[PDB]
Design a protein around this motif. Sequence first.
Motif, PDB file in Angstrom:
ATOM      1  N   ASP A  58       0.862  -1.213   0.000  1.00  0.00           N
ATOM      2  CA  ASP A  58       0.000   0.000   0.000  1.00  0.00           C
ATOM      3  C   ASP A  58       0.888   1.250   0.000  1.00  0.00           C
ATOM      4  OD1 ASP A  58      -2.647  -1.322   0.267  1.00  0.00           O
ATOM      5  OD2 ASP A  58      -1.936  -1.846   2.285  1.00  0.00           O
ATOM      6  N   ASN A  79      -4.947   6.674  -1.984  1.00  0.00           N
ATOM      7  CA  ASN A  79      -4.336   5.359  -1.648  1.00  0.00           C
ATOM      8  C   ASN A  79      -4.369   4.461  -2.890  1.00  0.00           C
ATOM      9  OD1 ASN A  79      -7.169   5.539  -1.174  1.00  0.00           O
ATOM     10  ND2 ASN A  79      -7.161   3.545  -0.154  1.00  0.00           N
ATOM     11  N   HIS A  81      -2.587   0.318  -4.329  1.00  0.00           N
ATOM     12  CA  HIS A  81      -1.966  -0.984  -3.961  1.00  0.00           C
ATOM     13  C   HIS A  81      -1.186  -1.541  -5.157  1.00  0.00           C
ATOM     14  CE1 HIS A  81      -1.672  -4.593  -1.398  1.00  0.00           C
ATOM     15  NE2 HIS A  81      -1.785  -5.277  -2.543  1.00  0.00           N
TER      16      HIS A  81
END
Length: 244
Positions: A58, A79, A81
């Motif tokens: 992350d 955010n 990933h």
Amino acid sequence: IPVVSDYEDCIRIDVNQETNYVTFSFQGQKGVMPIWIIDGKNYSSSFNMTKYYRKAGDYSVEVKIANSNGVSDRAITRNFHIDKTIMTGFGGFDPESNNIWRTATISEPTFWYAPGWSQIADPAYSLVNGTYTVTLPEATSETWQAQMPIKTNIATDAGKNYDFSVILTSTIDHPNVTVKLVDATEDKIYYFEGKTPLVANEPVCFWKSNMPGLDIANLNLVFDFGGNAAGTVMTIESIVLKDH
């Protein structure tokens, strides 16, 4: 001053899980611009940048919006990933191959080397058989504090699509080295503004495939070593620019 919430629809994060290159993009007016912030440091103020994330996990970016009147009080946090950890990455295209770099007139590197945004003498360099070798005595803390623009006479057309690669090596850990293939006339017109951290004496290959062509009379290849630790030696080699 810009209110940052108004520009949530204008900010896009593209994670390519097959290449591990995250593209950060903003759509705005001739005056408005984003400020891309990672680890509480300004990485780029350009409309888009591409950053290589070697390890899986992350990650976060903070985006402030700036105009002539000032910078936004708040930042948009986004955010994302990374699925995979690329141990054995792409080694680039054929440096010796029937590359537009080998053909065209490559000018000597200019420098803007400015710790604390105060310009000192140009660092010593050595272009020997394509391999650029640069030496950075003084430490810098910000992006654009150690610029290396290379002027070329390379023109490109809207009709074609282009591929690019370059191998970058650093004798000390470097958090963010930049590579930008930009129109010599217009700073806003470019194919990419690359970003990659470098671990001591581990060659990373920066590359992009099938890049939509632009009507540019003359290209400049601009490196930056802003954030370099004191006594850092940089090695640029295998600069390939070809039609796709």
